Design a protein around this nucleic acid. Structure first.
Ligand SMILES: [Mg+2]
Ligand SMILES: [Mg+2]
Ligand SMILES: [Mg+2]
Ligand SMILES: [Mg+2]
Ligand SMILES: [Mg+2]
Ligand SMILES: [Mg+2]
Ligand SMILES: [Mg+2]
Ligand SMILES: [Mg+2]
Ligand SMILES: [Mg+2]
Ligand SMILES: [Mg+2]
Ligand SMILES: [Mg+2]
Ligand SMILES: [Mg+2]
Lengths: 224, 88, 70, 170, 129, 74
RNA sequence: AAAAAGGACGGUGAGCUUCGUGACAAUUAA
RNA sequence: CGGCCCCCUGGACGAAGACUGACGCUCAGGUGCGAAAGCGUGGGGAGCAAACAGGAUUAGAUACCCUGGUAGUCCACGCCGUAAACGAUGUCGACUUGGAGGUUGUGCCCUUGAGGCGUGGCUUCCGGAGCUAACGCGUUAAGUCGACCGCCUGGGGAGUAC
């Protein structure tokens, strides 16, 4: 339901400097102002809407959505969005192999879940100091990164990615398993691995919130 | 490197008018004029091979145009060769 | 590099100014090049080598501003 | 909906910005080391707080404040924009000196030393030349007494190619 | 110098298909138009057009199905250095009949199937698959 | 005094689009020859290759006419 | 008459040989 | 091919056009050019320096190092026609996403400047697809093709014998 006006205010049309553009992004580039590319919104809006529909359709059939964003500017934003829609997110460093090596990272998930339980019950009495502090740091790391996927359970039904270039590793694994990919592709990004291309700004808090809000609304709608 | 007046003159007697600078007869006459001019220069400075490469290049170019001519309008050729000081 | 000592100029600072003037003129480096004789071919390589080195400095003066170390 | 061409033509006119121009940023968040500012650009800028702080170092800016900061880039910083405010303050210093030149306004400084043809003077971090015999109306034989004191000055010439401000109290 | 315009056409088609070009421009000629005219009936190209009178320009609209080149392969058979002529009984089958061979017969330029139905041989211009 | 000769490394010659620097002119040239009479590299002075060649040619002609020394040593 | 992106520091070595022939590879799966 | 100057002279490139009208590409044999060393004749001679001599080092040192030093290096006029003569990549033409620098033309725009937007030639470095045994090459291809020539078919014997 997002309108061209709101996207224009958020700076979605803004691309990167001409020094970094990828020529495969030419069809979605409207032009360059002051050596900065401008994304052609007249092509994004019809195509973005078609993606939003399919996401609603996937959410209608109990689909699982995995939001991927690692920029510290947008890390918390993605977290909040996923929490709202009871989805999953990875705000910390993407560990290689969540998707290709899922049957192994499950063990780390299992360790995380026991640590969440057995530390609240056990540490209080059996502190001893040293071991308690050690396991506490351990917990931090794991959750800080794997906290959003502890209860995910299995393979996702769709991927939502910010800055397809930065998270190229995540897209590769999703492509290997045939999981559909929805990525925000900037001018310096590679759209070859993306099944649903959304050309827009991936670096602005304003723009990223817009995108996350849009996607969050549609998925909740399908769920209901 | 030919002077402007010499180029303008040579065009007149070999071309229909002042703008027919491209006809084959004009090209041969222009080439022949420079071969004769560079001959006095090239008898001396015997080691000027770099300028000598240029002379052979116009000689080769003149050979193709004269051969091209003889193929068509044979007459024109004979008038040209008699008017110029070239054996062949 | 001709240096003239001015009034109320300490001798030590005049010598220090002399070190810079010779250094900026490259007198010591020049004499080193000309002490022995260099061969046309070799030198050319050294020059091109240093030139590639400076080109790499440029390509490292940028793009390197990314990634982490700790 | 309005055509993108017309919309972007609109957007740039309410913005009026360019690498050489000045921008009107909006303060988003105030952190210990940096301040988040939005100038309508493609990315928030984490501008260090000391740039916004006044000469005395007290926080004069609050969330939501409008700041006439200078533009540095748009995505040079790892794809992010950088903003400058000390340069805007430097511009403020230069323009008030220009007013002192034209409108005869007063700019205050300190005489730092004496040179062959006059005095070296300090104007908020700028070097100035004060002619020896034009310091004051009264022809005092020993003019050294005014060194090291805060004094008003009027700009006679401003050379950007040397950062040299020729000034006199006359 | 340019000595085989037909091979230039094959490279223009092959390179544009590999580069995902929408359209390709080239100098025009009767034979090129005739080959492009033949290409239309089998669906290898979208459309062709001719602009200009002193210096005609042949314009072909390339075709893609799933973002992939329609012309998988094309290669020259008869070349200026080596002319290839085939009798009707010996006419080659390109891409097991799924592709076509452009044959210049006495009745004009046609495909291998058209020559086979008409019982005619000729010069094998190119293989398309 | 306030002696300060900050050089932002721009082409003085380019300003005026000099079609050809002149050897005869001395004052201008001097502002680009080091005390030890050596030619300052374009890396430091920032001049374009086209004008430096004119500059180098002109200074060497001036040098022949003994308007400026080859070296300070004499 | 400055702010690192550092312009470059030349300081230097005397000499210090050769290891007999063939054999440690040895295996693969249903 | 590197001081400066003069005389004679070759090629390249650009702008706006005019003219000729396929006059083109490649090329066995052929011909010319072709670093250095070397050779012939006549000059010249500083420095440097094969050979050579002496002094060192070493078990020896017909070497490296040191002190000397002839041919040669220079000039004139001939000869030789060999080089890791290398981009180890023959020439010509077309085509196949980009980025930065260098150099050299040229068009337009409040010239507003120590500006902006194009459009040619040459050249350097990153690199996409593609290609490649890999390294790598990558619009200046080692990519996709066309025209022509040279050349290779195990190492050694041997680039040798006749
Ligand atoms: Mg031959
Ligand atoms: Mg010799
Ligand atoms: Mg001799
Ligand atoms: Mg002799
Ligand atoms: Mg001895
Ligand atoms: Mg001996
Ligand atoms: Mg010796
Ligand atoms: Mg050979
Ligand atoms: Mg060579
Ligand atoms: Mg070999
Ligand atoms: Mg490369
Ligand atoms: Mg032999």
């Amino acid at each position: 339901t997002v309108s061209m006006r709101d996207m224009l205010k958020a700076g979605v049309h803004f691309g990167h400097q001409t020094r970094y553009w990828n020529p495969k992004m030419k069809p979605f580039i409207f032009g360059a102002r002051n050596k900065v590319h401008i994304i052609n919104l007249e092509k994004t809006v019809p195509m973005f809407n078609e993606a939003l529909a399919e996401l609603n359709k996937i959410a209608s059939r109990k689909g699982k959505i995995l939001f991927v964003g690692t920029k510290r500017a947008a890390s918390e934003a993605v977290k909040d969005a996923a929490l709202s829609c009871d989805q999953f997110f990875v705000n910390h460093r993407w560990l290689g192999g969540m998707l290709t090596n899922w049957k192994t990272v499950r063990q780390s998930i299992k360790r995380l879940k026991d640590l969440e339980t057995q530390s609240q019950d056990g540490t209080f009495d059996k502190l001893t100091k040293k071991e308690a502090l050690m396991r506490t740091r351990e917990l931090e790391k794991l959750e800080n990164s794997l906290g959003g996927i502890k209860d995910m359970g299995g393979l996702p039904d769709a991927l939502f990615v910010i800055d397809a270039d930065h998270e190229h590793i995540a897209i590769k694994e999703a492509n290997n398993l045939g999981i559909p990919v929805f990525a925000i592709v900037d001018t310096n990004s590679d759209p070859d691995g993306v099944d649903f291309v959304i050309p827009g700004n991936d670096d602005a808090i304003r723009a990223v919130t817009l995108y996350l809000g849009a996607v969050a609304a549609t998925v909740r709608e399908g769920r209901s | 490197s030919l002077s402007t007046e010499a180029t303008a003159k040579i065009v007149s007697e070999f071309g229909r008018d002042a703008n027919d600078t491209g006809s084959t007869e004009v090209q041969v006459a222009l080439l022949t004029a420079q071969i004769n001019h560079l001959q006095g220069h090239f008898a001396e400075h015997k080691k000027d091979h770099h300028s000598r490469r240029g002379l052979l290049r116009m000689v080769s170019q003149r050979r193709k145009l004269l051969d091209y001519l003889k193929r068509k309008d044979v007459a024109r050729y004979t008038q040209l060769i008699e008017r110029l000081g070239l054996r062949r | 590099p001709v240096i003239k000592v001015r009034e109320n100029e300490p001798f030590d600072v005049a010598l220090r100014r002399f070190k810079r003037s010779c250094e900026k003129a490259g007198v010591l480096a020049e004499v080193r090049r000309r002490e022995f004789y260099e061969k046309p071919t070799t030198e050319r390589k050294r020059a091109k080598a240093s030139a590639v080195k400076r080109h790499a400095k440029k390509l490292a003066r940028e793009n390197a501003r990314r990634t982490r170390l700790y | 909906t309005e055509s993108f061409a017309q919309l972007f033509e609109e957007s740039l006119k309410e913005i009026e910005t360019r690498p050489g121009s000045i921008v009107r940023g909006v303060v988003v968040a105030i952190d210990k080391d940096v301040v988040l500012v939005d100038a309508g650009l493609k990315s928030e800028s984490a501008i260090p707080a000391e740039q916004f702080k006044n000469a005395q170092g007290e926080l004069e800016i609050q969330v939501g404040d409008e700041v006439d900061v200078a533009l540095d880039a748009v995505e040079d910083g790892f794809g992010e924009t950088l903003l400058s405010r000390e340069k805007a303050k430097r511009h403020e210093a230069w323009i008030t000196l220009e007013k002192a030149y034209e409108d005869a306004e007063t700019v205050t400084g300190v005489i730092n030393g004496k040179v062959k043809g006059g005095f070296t003077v300090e104007l908020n971090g700028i070097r100035a030349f004060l002619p020896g015999s034009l310091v004051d109306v009264r022809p005092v034989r020993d003019t050294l007494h005014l060194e090291g004191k805060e004094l008003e000055f009027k700009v006679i010439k401003l050379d950007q190619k040397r950062n040299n401000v020729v000034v006199s109290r006359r | 110098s340019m000595q085989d315009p037909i091979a230039d056409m094959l490279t223009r088609i092959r390179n544009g298909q590999a580069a995902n070009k929408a359209a390709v421009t080239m100098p025009s000629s009767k034979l090129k138009v005739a080959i492009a005219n033949v290409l239309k009936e089998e669906g290898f190209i979208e459309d062709f057009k001719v602009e200009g009178d002193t210096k005609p320009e042949l314009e072909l609209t390339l075709k893609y199905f799933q973002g992939k080149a329609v012309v998988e392969s094309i290669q020259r058979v008869s070349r200026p250095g080596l002319r290839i002529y085939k009798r009707k009984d010996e006419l080659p089958k390109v891409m097991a009949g799924l592709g076509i061979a452009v044959v210049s017969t006495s009745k004009g330029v046609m495909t291998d199937r058209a020559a086979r139905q008409a019982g005619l041989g000729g010069e094998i211009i190119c293989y398309v698959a | 005094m306030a002696r300060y000769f900050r050089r932002r490394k721009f082409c003085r010659f380019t300003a005026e689009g000099v079609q050809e620097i002149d050897y005869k002119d001395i004052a201008t040239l001097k502002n680009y020859i080091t005390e030890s009479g050596k030619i300052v590299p374009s890396r430091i002075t920032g001049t374009r290759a086209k004008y430096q060649r004119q500059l180098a040619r002109a200074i060497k002609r001036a040098r022949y006419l003994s308007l400026l020394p080859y070296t300070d040593r004499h």
